[PDB]
């Protein structure tokens, strides 16, 4: 099994699965996506062809997939804004879009291994490997429809409250 290693660490390694890898890689990528979608509480997921996506996985020293990041190409995204408080979690965004390259469609870390910089290293791996001969900046990635955990992560990782978001309608 040829394996595409992006980065190696003392506590595991980050690998990437591309749309034109062998079937065994694409099934493992799918199994991992299924677990993530389920973890997020989806019963059914009907979307475009995964042939657009790239799947990054953080593999522990025990050969377990404990982190997963699915990236897809995007063109534009929107700065997130805090929902104004009511007089007596959600988010909004700006109306003007900004240019962006990489949209993080799903990001997940096994719960017992959270707060160990796994997600941060997966995004790092993406920023260095998504586009040939370029390292994306934090202003060139966006996150789809973030969960509360996603917001807290992205605002720290990107070092701003108004990080880029995508994958929404009106």
């Amino acid at each position: 099994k040829k394996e595409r290693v992006i980065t190696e660490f003392w506590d595991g390694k980050i690998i990437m699965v591309s749309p034109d890898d062998p079937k065994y890689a694409l099934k493992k990528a799918e199994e991992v996506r299924e677990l993530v979608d389920s973890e997020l509480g989806f019963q059914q997921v009907s979307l475009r062809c995964p042939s657009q996506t790239r799947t990054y996985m953080f593999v522990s020293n025990e050969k377990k997939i404990v982190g997963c990041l699915i990236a897809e190409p995007i063109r534009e995204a929107y700065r997130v804004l805090a929902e104004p408080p009511s007089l007596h979690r959600a988010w909004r965004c700006s109306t003007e879009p900004e240019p962006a390259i990489c949209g993080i469609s799903r990001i997940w870390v096994f719960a017992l291994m959270r707060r160990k910089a796994i997600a941060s290293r997966m995004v790092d791996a993406v920023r260095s490997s998504f586009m040939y001969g370029s390292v994306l900046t934090t202003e060139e990635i966006a996150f789809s429809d973030p969960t509360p955990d996603g917001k807290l992560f992205a605002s720290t990782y990107c070092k701003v409250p108004d990080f880029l978001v995508y994958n929404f309608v009106s």
Binding site: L40, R92, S144, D145, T147, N167, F168, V169, S170
Partner: peptide, 6 residues
């Protein structure tokens, strides 16, 4: 707002 998640 609909959103590809919620």
């Amino acid at each position: 707002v609909i959103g590809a998640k919620k």
